[PDB]
Amino acid sequence: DSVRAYLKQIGKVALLNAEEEVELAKRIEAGLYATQKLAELAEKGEKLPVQQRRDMQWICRDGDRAKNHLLEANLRLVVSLAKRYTGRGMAFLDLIQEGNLGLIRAVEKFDYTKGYKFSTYATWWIRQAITRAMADQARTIRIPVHMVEVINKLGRIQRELLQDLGREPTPEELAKEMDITPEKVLEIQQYAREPISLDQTIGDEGDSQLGDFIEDSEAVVAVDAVSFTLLQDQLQSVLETLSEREAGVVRLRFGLTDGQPRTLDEIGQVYGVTRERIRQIESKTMSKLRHPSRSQVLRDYL
């Protein structure tokens, strides 16, 4: 396995104890403030003496090394905490890495003045980071954290209802035990579904996988498409039978040229004409067109 190498690596360093963590944290804080004092002096450019310069350059680097040692000491704890979420959603080593990020944050916020063990405080951040990573990255279609929590609650009460009533719980029972309307619980139910791989083995074997027998409902069908190319032409011919002005308003009103359904006011700029005359012309043209003498030609593309 690719994980056993990590298990071997983490055994290099030994576990710490309370007082050791105490002076480690003290050294980290002292080194951070030493860096701050370095910056403060460098802002003025104050002459840090040669001996004090080396002493400070040692103390800060020792603080960084203490941070590294403290981080490396708790990898066993991180792995142990991450081991609880194996087998659902995310890979084991991904969970270990997210726990490592959580441990890094815990070390960032760890306080030694409290006198508390690092183990108790780390376990909060490590668990939080593992849960966040599992929620964000465990599904192809990403659902937000709140919806993930709602889905987990739905599953929990569904299992409880199944155990109690001893039967397939209808959505009404789920709603009653969740205090939510049937529609919302149904929405959560449908959201919780996982997509099925398009490369399955439908057919009991590998002759067809899944998609060799799926038809596109949005397919381009030739007979319709060609018909459309004719319809335009027919209209282009039919609108030619009308007068120049009568044909223009219909073309501009429906935008056969540009596509914009120009309002009457816009069409009023053809001659400064008011909306009412343009409406009258449009109605007259509509009466002319809908008569069988012209409409019978087009009465199949409906």
Partner: protein
């Protein structure tokens, strides 16, 4: 088209890869969960 004489293959120095691409995939998300539109800067990004 219909003007081929031979087809050749070779390695890619990642300059060809950077030339082909129309943009890098910053994020892993594919599509929104309740709405079914693609997520920007991720897979399926428009």
């Amino acid at each position: 088209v219909n003007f081929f004489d031979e087809l050749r293959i070779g390695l890619a120095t990642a300059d060809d890869i950077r030339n082909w691409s129309y943009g890098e995939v910053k994020k892993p998300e594919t599509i929104n969960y309740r709405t079914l539109k693609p997520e920007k800067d991720g897979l399926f990004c428009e």
